[PDB]
From a paper:
High-resolution crystal structures and biophysical analyses of a truncated form of the TbMORN1 protein and its homologues from the parasites Toxoplasma gondii (TgMORN1) and Plasmodium falciparum (PfMORN1) enabled, for the first time, a structure-based definition of the MORN repeat. All three structures are antiparallel dimers joined via their C-termini, and, when possessed of the correct key residues, can adopt extended or V-shaped quaternary structures. The crystal structures confirmed that each 23-amino acid MORN repeat is composed of a β-hairpin followed by a 6-residue loop that connects to the next MORN repeat. The structural studies presented here make a case that one conserved function of MORN repeats is in homotypic interactions and possibly also in higher-order assembly.
The structures of TgMORN1(7–15) and both P21 and C2 crystal forms of TbMORN1(7–15) were subsequently determined to 2.90, 2.35 and 2.53 Å resolution, respectively, with the PfMORN1(7–15) structure used as a search model for the molecular replacement. The two subunits in the TbMORN1(7–15) C2 crystal form and the TgMORN1(7–15) dimer make a rather straight assembly, while in the P21 form they display a bend of about 30°, leading to a rod-shaped particle appearance. In contrast to the other two proteins, the P21 crystal structure of TbMORN1(7–15) displays a bend of approximately 30° among the sub-units. In the P21 and C2 TbMORN1(7–15) crystal forms, the dimer interfaces occupy surface areas of 747 Å2 and 966 Å2, respectively. Calculations of gain in solvation free energy (ΔiG) upon dimer formation for TbMORN1(7–15) C2 and P21 performed with the PDBePISA package yielded values of -20.1 kcal/mol and -11.3 kcal/mol, respectively, with corresponding p-values of interface specificity 0.01 and 0.08. Here, the side chain of Cys351 is engaged in a polar interaction with Asp303.
Residue numbers in the entry:
A (entry chain CCC): 143 to 352
B (entry chain AAA): 143 to 354
The structure:
Amino acid sequence: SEKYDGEWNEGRMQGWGKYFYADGGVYEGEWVDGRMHGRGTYVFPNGNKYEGEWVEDRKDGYGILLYTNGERYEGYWHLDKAHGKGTLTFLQGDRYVGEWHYGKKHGHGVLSYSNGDTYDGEWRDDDAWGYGVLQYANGCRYEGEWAEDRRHGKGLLVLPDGSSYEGSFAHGKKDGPGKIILKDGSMYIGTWKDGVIVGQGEFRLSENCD
Amino acid sequence: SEKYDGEWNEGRMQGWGKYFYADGGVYEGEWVDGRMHGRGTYVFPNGNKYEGEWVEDRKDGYGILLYTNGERYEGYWHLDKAHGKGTLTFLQGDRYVGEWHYGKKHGHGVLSYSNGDTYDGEWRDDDAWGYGVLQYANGCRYEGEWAEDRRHGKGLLVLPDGSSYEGSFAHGKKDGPGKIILKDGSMYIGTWKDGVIVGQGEFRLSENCDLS
């Protein structure tokens, strides 16, 4: 009573009710055995707002959280964190659609950046990890391996003009053995370090004129 | 005396006269001191014909020789051989216009092949020798050194698509140190043997949307 305006059952909050927390936060929604449980709205004193499902005072099931910072999560929650399928939109216009593991981008997901870049592929612990495709705004496309949100392992870099690089990347740059095919179809097989050709390599003219 | 129907001076053939040689050849033309000398026509028993200038029984000055085999020389002669400027046309349609040294293509000369190919440059002893340009029919152009009628020394090979090779040739083929530009600007510096790249070399990307 006073701090809780709602229904009771066996001396515990149960049914619909409003609760005013000491820090200025307000819940209005379903209660089970004295906890937020079922559908309910939580307006936080920091400006955040949740509308969705609750289990034992935690966000659990379907819910929408509008963040102060302009971010908006719409999808599934487990133990008070993003879990399963969910969409995160940012104020700038960036959008993530895909899999979540206790509050982190994890599994397969598509992140459409407002800058025009799109990443379609694998995530671990909020970073690009595994195989994924980045379609850059300028026409460049990387299809290959990622580690700690950077291109790392074997990958294909197709340029707008038709040029490609097939080979190794390390810490985001061409690094190790690789091959470039040029506009005219001729190919160079050689070695990169920190994104630049080092030493010498094999050059083979295309069979389309010589 | 009956072999010659023409004029005399100091008991020697001089002025205009006809002569019938034992082998069936016939000269009609100018005579000086009992020799073919000045303007005259010689029909040879092998079918060849000369019309032009003579000095002491030799083709010397301007003259046309039509050969049985279909070749035609038109130009200058010295001591009975092509010498100075002269045009040789062949049955096939091939044409040489340029310099001659005692019967050989020698100095500067243009050979227009019926193929469409043109060679403009230097000759020694009937072969391309020194600097010359071959404008091929297909658009390719070689500008560089020749030896024994084949590309040999340093040369530039520009392809129709803008690709070029700058470097060494031996016996007609890319051979030794050289460099390719691909027109997109990208360049390979390496080594050739018998017209093919051998081993490895230096590759430098051009400023296309590939180093950016």
